[PDB]
Short mmCIF file of C-alpha atoms and ligand atoms in Angstrom, two decimals:
data_model
loop_
_atom_site.label_atom_id
_atom_site.label_comp_id
_atom_site.label_asym_id
_atom_site.label_seq_id
_atom_site.Cartn_x
_atom_site.Cartn_y
_atom_site.Cartn_z
CA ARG B 1 132.60 67.49 63.29
CA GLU B 2 129.70 69.62 61.84
CA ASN B 3 126.82 67.39 63.07
CA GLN B 4 126.30 70.47 65.35
CA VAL B 5 122.99 72.49 65.30
CA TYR B 6 123.00 76.34 65.61
CA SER B 7 120.21 78.91 66.30
CA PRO B 8 119.06 80.32 62.92
CA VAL B 9 118.58 83.74 64.68
CA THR B 10 121.71 84.26 66.92
CA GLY B 11 124.14 81.60 65.53
CA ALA B 12 124.42 80.24 69.12
CA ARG B 13 125.32 76.50 69.40
CA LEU B 14 122.23 74.51 70.51
CA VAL B 15 123.06 72.36 73.62
CA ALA B 16 120.78 70.19 75.82
CA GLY B 17 121.55 68.79 79.30
CA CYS B 18 120.12 67.38 82.57
CA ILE B 19 119.91 68.50 86.18
CA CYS B 20 119.97 64.89 87.57
CA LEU B 21 118.50 64.74 91.14
CA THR B 22 118.22 61.91 93.69
CA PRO B 23 114.63 60.68 94.27
CA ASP B 24 114.63 62.55 97.66
CA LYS B 25 115.85 65.68 95.70
CA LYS B 26 118.64 66.56 98.24
CA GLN B 27 121.57 66.08 95.77
CA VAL B 28 122.46 66.83 92.08
CA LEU B 29 124.93 64.74 89.99
CA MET B 30 127.96 66.71 88.72
CA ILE B 31 130.83 65.76 86.32
CA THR B 32 134.42 67.13 86.09
CA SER B 33 135.11 69.18 82.87
CA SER B 34 137.25 67.40 80.19
CA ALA B 35 139.64 70.38 79.52
CA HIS B 36 139.99 71.41 83.25
CA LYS B 37 139.96 68.42 85.67
CA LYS B 38 139.07 70.30 88.94
CA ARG B 39 135.99 72.15 87.43
CA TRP B 40 132.61 70.48 88.37
CA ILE B 41 129.70 71.05 85.83
CA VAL B 42 126.48 69.13 84.79
CA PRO B 43 126.01 66.72 81.83
CA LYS B 44 125.28 68.51 78.48
CA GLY B 45 126.35 68.57 74.80
CA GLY B 46 125.62 69.79 71.26
CA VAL B 47 122.32 68.67 69.68
CA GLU B 48 123.14 66.66 66.48
CA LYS B 49 121.37 67.08 63.07
CA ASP B 50 119.53 63.68 63.34
CA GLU B 51 118.10 64.12 66.90
CA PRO B 52 114.32 64.77 66.89
CA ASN B 53 114.06 66.68 70.25
CA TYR B 54 116.18 68.23 73.07
CA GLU B 55 115.17 65.41 75.52
CA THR B 56 117.03 62.93 73.19
CA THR B 57 120.24 65.05 73.34
CA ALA B 58 119.88 65.56 77.15
CA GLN B 59 119.56 61.79 77.96
CA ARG B 60 122.26 60.85 75.34
CA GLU B 61 124.78 63.27 76.98
CA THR B 62 123.77 62.26 80.60
CA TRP B 63 124.64 58.64 79.62
CA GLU B 64 127.86 59.43 77.62
CA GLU B 65 129.31 61.94 80.19
CA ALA B 66 128.00 60.67 83.61
CA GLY B 67 126.86 57.04 83.02
CA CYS B 68 123.48 58.16 84.44
CA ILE B 69 120.03 56.74 83.46
CA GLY B 70 116.67 58.15 84.63
CA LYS B 71 113.34 59.75 83.66
CA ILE B 72 112.80 63.43 82.70
CA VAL B 73 110.32 64.88 85.28
CA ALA B 74 110.45 68.61 84.25
CA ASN B 75 111.36 70.98 81.37
CA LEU B 76 113.65 73.61 83.01
CA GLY B 77 113.51 75.79 79.83
CA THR B 78 116.52 77.71 78.37
CA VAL B 79 119.65 79.53 79.67
CA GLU B 80 122.42 81.20 77.58
CA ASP B 81 126.24 81.17 77.79
CA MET B 82 126.78 84.99 77.63
CA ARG B 83 130.64 84.69 77.88
CA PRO B 84 132.08 87.05 75.18
CA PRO B 85 134.26 85.80 72.25
CA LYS B 86 138.11 85.28 72.23
CA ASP B 87 138.58 88.66 70.37
CA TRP B 88 137.78 90.26 73.82
CA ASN B 89 140.47 91.62 76.28
CA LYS B 90 142.77 92.75 73.36
CA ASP B 91 139.77 94.78 71.94
CA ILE B 92 139.78 98.65 72.16
CA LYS B 93 135.94 98.80 72.74
CA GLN B 94 135.32 96.42 75.74
CA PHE B 95 132.49 97.76 78.08
CA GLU B 96 129.24 99.80 77.58
CA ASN B 97 128.45 102.03 80.64
CA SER B 98 124.95 103.31 81.69
CA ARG B 99 124.30 106.09 84.31
CA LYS B 100 123.51 103.79 87.34
CA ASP B 101 124.90 100.44 85.98
CA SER B 102 127.68 98.84 83.80
CA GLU B 103 127.40 96.01 81.19
CA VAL B 104 129.66 93.90 78.89
CA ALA B 105 129.67 95.25 75.25
CA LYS B 106 126.59 93.81 73.38
CA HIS B 107 127.27 90.37 71.73
CA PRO B 108 125.26 87.27 70.68
CA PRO B 109 125.25 84.23 73.03
CA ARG B 110 127.94 81.53 72.50
CA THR B 111 125.45 78.74 73.47
CA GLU B 112 121.68 78.30 74.05
CA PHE B 113 121.06 75.50 76.67
CA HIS B 114 117.80 73.48 76.88
CA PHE B 115 117.81 71.92 80.42
CA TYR B 116 115.59 69.12 81.78
CA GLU B 117 115.25 67.81 85.36
CA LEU B 118 115.91 64.03 85.56
CA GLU B 119 115.18 61.70 88.54
CA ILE B 120 118.25 59.37 88.75
CA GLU B 121 117.16 55.67 88.37
CA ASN B 122 120.70 54.13 88.03
CA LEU B 123 124.44 55.06 87.93
CA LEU B 124 126.67 52.57 85.98
CA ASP B 125 130.44 52.06 86.62
CA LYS B 126 131.23 51.74 82.83
CA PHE B 127 130.08 54.56 80.47
CA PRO B 128 131.73 56.09 77.34
CA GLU B 129 133.65 58.89 79.23
CA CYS B 130 134.38 56.40 82.14
CA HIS B 131 138.13 57.30 82.36
CA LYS B 132 137.89 60.92 81.00
CA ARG B 133 135.73 62.38 83.88
CA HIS B 134 134.78 61.98 87.58
CA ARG B 135 131.08 61.99 88.67
CA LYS B 136 129.75 62.73 92.21
CA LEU B 137 126.50 63.74 93.98
CA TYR B 138 126.43 67.14 95.80
CA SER B 139 123.96 69.03 98.07
CA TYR B 140 122.56 72.37 96.72
CA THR B 141 125.08 74.44 98.80
CA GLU B 142 128.07 72.37 97.45
CA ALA B 143 126.68 72.34 93.85
CA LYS B 144 126.12 76.17 93.89
CA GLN B 145 129.79 76.77 94.93
CA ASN B 146 131.08 74.29 92.24
CA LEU B 147 129.30 76.20 89.40
CA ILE B 148 130.53 79.61 90.72
CA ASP B 149 134.14 78.20 90.95
CA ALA B 150 133.59 76.82 87.36
CA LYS B 151 132.52 80.38 86.19
CA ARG B 152 129.13 79.02 84.89
CA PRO B 153 126.25 81.05 86.43
CA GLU B 154 123.91 79.97 83.53
CA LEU B 155 124.28 76.32 84.76
CA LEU B 156 123.50 77.55 88.30
CA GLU B 157 120.36 79.28 86.87
CA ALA B 158 119.31 75.89 85.39
CA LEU B 159 119.97 74.21 88.82
CA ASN B 160 117.91 76.90 90.67
CA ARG B 161 114.86 76.18 88.40
CA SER B 162 115.02 72.44 89.45
CA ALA B 163 113.13 70.91 92.45
CA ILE B 164 116.51 70.47 94.34
CA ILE B 165 116.08 71.19 98.12
CA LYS B 166 118.07 74.44 98.74
CA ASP B 167 117.38 74.61 102.56
CA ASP B 168 120.68 73.07 103.87
O1 LIG N 1 136.28 75.16 74.78
P1 LIG N 1 136.57 73.70 75.08
O2 LIG N 1 136.77 72.88 73.82
O3 LIG N 1 137.72 73.54 76.06
O4 LIG N 1 135.27 73.09 75.82
C1 LIG N 1 134.07 73.84 76.22
C2 LIG N 1 133.15 74.00 75.02
O5 LIG N 1 133.68 74.98 74.07
P2 LIG N 1 132.91 76.40 74.13
O6 LIG N 1 132.36 76.50 75.54
O7 LIG N 1 133.92 77.49 73.83
O8 LIG N 1 131.80 76.34 73.09
C3 LIG N 1 132.94 72.63 74.40
O9 LIG N 1 132.21 72.73 73.14
P3 LIG N 1 132.87 72.16 71.78
O10 LIG N 1 134.35 71.98 72.07
O11 LIG N 1 132.18 70.84 71.47
O12 LIG N 1 132.62 73.20 70.70
C4 LIG N 1 132.15 71.85 75.43
O13 LIG N 1 131.64 70.59 74.89
P4 LIG N 1 130.04 70.55 74.82
O14 LIG N 1 129.55 71.92 74.49
O15 LIG N 1 129.50 69.92 76.07
O16 LIG N 1 129.77 69.60 73.55
P5 LIG N 1 129.53 68.02 73.37
O17 LIG N 1 130.81 67.48 72.76
O18 LIG N 1 129.27 67.46 74.75
O19 LIG N 1 128.35 67.89 72.44
C5 LIG N 1 133.04 71.64 76.64
O20 LIG N 1 132.37 70.78 77.62
P6 LIG N 1 132.92 69.28 77.84
O21 LIG N 1 132.03 68.37 77.02
O22 LIG N 1 132.81 69.00 79.33
O23 LIG N 1 134.36 69.27 77.35
C6 LIG N 1 133.31 73.01 77.24
O24 LIG N 1 134.07 72.87 78.48
P7 LIG N 1 133.17 72.59 79.78
O25 LIG N 1 131.73 72.60 79.27
O26 LIG N 1 133.44 73.72 80.77
O27 LIG N 1 133.58 71.23 80.31
MG1 LIG N 2 129.61 68.31 76.78
#
């Protein structure tokens, strides 16, 4: 329902989420997508009209989606879902070509993500989406492949900004 907050400039849906790392920073916590059960992503969701800051949304969604509690240790800034709309692929005008490069036809972002790095302090067996999702730790190498397979490079960008150890 329309508790959802949108960018006043681009109309993009405002979403906050967490890159949750182990204290030793060797693994990130990932969740299966609701719609597609074999796609691994990170906890995130729409900011609601009442919420005073993005941190609130981020920790609310990390609890609801992954039953994960911890402390925010870093602001990882913003990334955008630049997937085109659903009008695409049956459109006549689809790509815009340069001289030494090619691009998708100009469009506003679907979603503007505000990501935070969280140090995991606890994982609980019962959480709201307990029976709707799976939730597992993954090394950088394994996490990177998950987000490529999921078709979510913007979530990988968020992950790359974190203090996760990539040398493995
Ligand atoms: O298209 P869909 O309905 O199949 O689901 C998409 C997305 O729609 P879009 O990408 O076209 O905008 C959903 O947004 P909406 O449906 O609320 O508009 C989004 O929920 P979200 O943004 O996290 O919002 P919160 O409810 O957490 O606040 C959902 O994440 P999941 O929560 O895991 O399902 C996404 O699948 P993926 O993220 O890959 O798993
Ligand atoms: Mg969500």
